[PDB]
Amino acid sequence: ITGNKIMRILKSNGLAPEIPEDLYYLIKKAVSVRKHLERNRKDKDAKFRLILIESRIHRLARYYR
Amino acid sequence: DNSQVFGVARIYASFNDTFVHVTDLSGKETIARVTGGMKVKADRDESSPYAAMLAAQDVAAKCREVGITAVHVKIRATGGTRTKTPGPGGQAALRALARSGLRIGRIEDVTPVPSDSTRKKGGRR
RNA sequence: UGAAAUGCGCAGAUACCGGGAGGAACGCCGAUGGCGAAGGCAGCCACCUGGUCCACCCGUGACGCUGAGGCGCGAAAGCGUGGGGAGCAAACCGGAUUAGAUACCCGGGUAGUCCACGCCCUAAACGAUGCGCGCUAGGUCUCUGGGUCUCCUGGGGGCCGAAGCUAA
């Protein structure tokens, strides 16, 4: 993501400590990854990256509340 | 014929035979020699590093009349000889030239290679 | 080739020049190097994409570690359908060697090796060394970042070695 699309997502997410912001960033990155994965099914190594992001998101929600 | 003095020498080695041809700065060949050119018969003449040596010299000497002095050597292909001598086959030619009297400006390996023409046999591939 | 022979060549081979077609691999750089969780990954170009290090210490405020079963990935060979097939080459067909040669050597050669989609799931899958964290002399070479850059500091790769450990 570019265009500071990241920044905009960050700013829009919140003044807060960005745990929720983090959730947003992760969802955004994940979606793109899922998108990437739509193609390049073969790309296993990339998938691993998704594994981390999805994992971290899942974990954060639990930790958060 | 018309003195040149500076030119190119192409050494084309092969497992079968060595053929060297000298050329102008332009690329047009002045003269050429091979193991066949000298009277040596097919097996021995053709490859034998000795032959390559003789051919190299014959090429230079003939070129000397052309008034050749300095030359750029280009090596194409690999090959040599069966002979007991070390017989790199190609190297001897490269040597004979340096010695022949012509000053060799440079030795360059530009052995051509196919993109991938056809399958080689001969235990290759 | 140890010597050879099979083999190819006068329908002209080999060696040489030019043109074309096709497949596979990617010399030098290249390392004693780098990347990845492993398997593994090296022509160049663009796009898509994962991991990772460092500086600032700015934000959250224990959100951490490991992880049975699951799920996924997993060299080669191998399997299914289709494609491709230059070189190589199990099987196979010959030549030689030998006491014999179902081998090693030489000439051929099919599957396969390549691509796609699906399957198989193994290995000396090795560092033969599970993951995380803390603590315990140094020296030397190296890759990558920062610094007040003849050295200090962080991450990685090697060598030698304190204490200690070890049956060695």
Q: How many CA atoms lie within 13 A of B119 on its CB side?
A: 3
Smallest CA–C1' separation from A20, nucleotide: C60
- Hey, CA dihedral for A41, A43, A46, A47, is it positive or negative? positive
Contact predicate B68/B24, CB 8 Å: no
Neighbours of A28 (CB within 10 A): 17
Among B65, B49, B68, which residue's Cα sits nearest to residue B11?
B49
Which residue matches tokens 């003195």?
B3
Q: Could you tell me where the DSSP H helices lie in chain A?
A: 5-13, 19-38, 44-64
In whole angstroms, C60 C1' to A9 CA is: 17
d(CA B97, CA B91): 10
Smallest CA–C1' separation from B110, nucleotide: C27
Among B73, B124, B122, B121, which residue's Cα sits nearest to residue B96?
B73
In whole angstroms, C131 C1' to B71 CA is: 67
The side-by-side arrangement of strands in the sheet containing B19-24 is: B29-34, B19-24, B6-12, B70-76, B103-109
Contact predicate B44/B107, CB 8 Å: no
In whole angstroms, C109 C1' to B119 CA is: 14
Contact predicate B97/B8, CB 8 Å: no
d(CA B4, CA B62): 12
d(CA A41, CA A38): 6
DSSP code at position B121: -
In whole angstroms, C146 C1' to A3 CA is: 28
Q: How many residues does chain A have?
A: 65
Beta strand spans in chain B (E):
6-12, 19-24, 29-34, 70-76, 103-109
Q: Strand C nucleotides below 7 A of a protein CB?
A: 1, 13-18, 20-25, 36-39, 48-52, 59-64, 72-74, 85-89, 106-109, 117-118
What type of residue sits at position B30? Answer: T
Q: Which residue is nearest to nucleotide C62 (CA to C1')?
A: A63
Q: What pairing do the DSSP bridges indicate for beta strands B70-76 and B6-12?
A: parallel
**Measured at the alpha carbon of residue B54, what is the angle toward residues B100 and B90, in degrees to the nearest 5?**
85
Q: Could you tell me where the DSSP H helices lie in chain B?
A: 42-47, 49-65, 90-100
d(CA A57, CA B14): 67
Q: What pairing do the DSSP bridges indicate for beta strands B103-109 and B70-76?
A: parallel
- Residue B107 has which token pair? 């030795």
List, in order, residues 6 or more apart from B4 with CB less than 8 Å away: B24, B25, B30, B66, B67, B68
Smallest CA–C1' separation from A39, nucleotide: C48
Could you tell me how far CA A38 lies from the centroid of its own chain? 16
Resolution of this structure in Å:
11.7
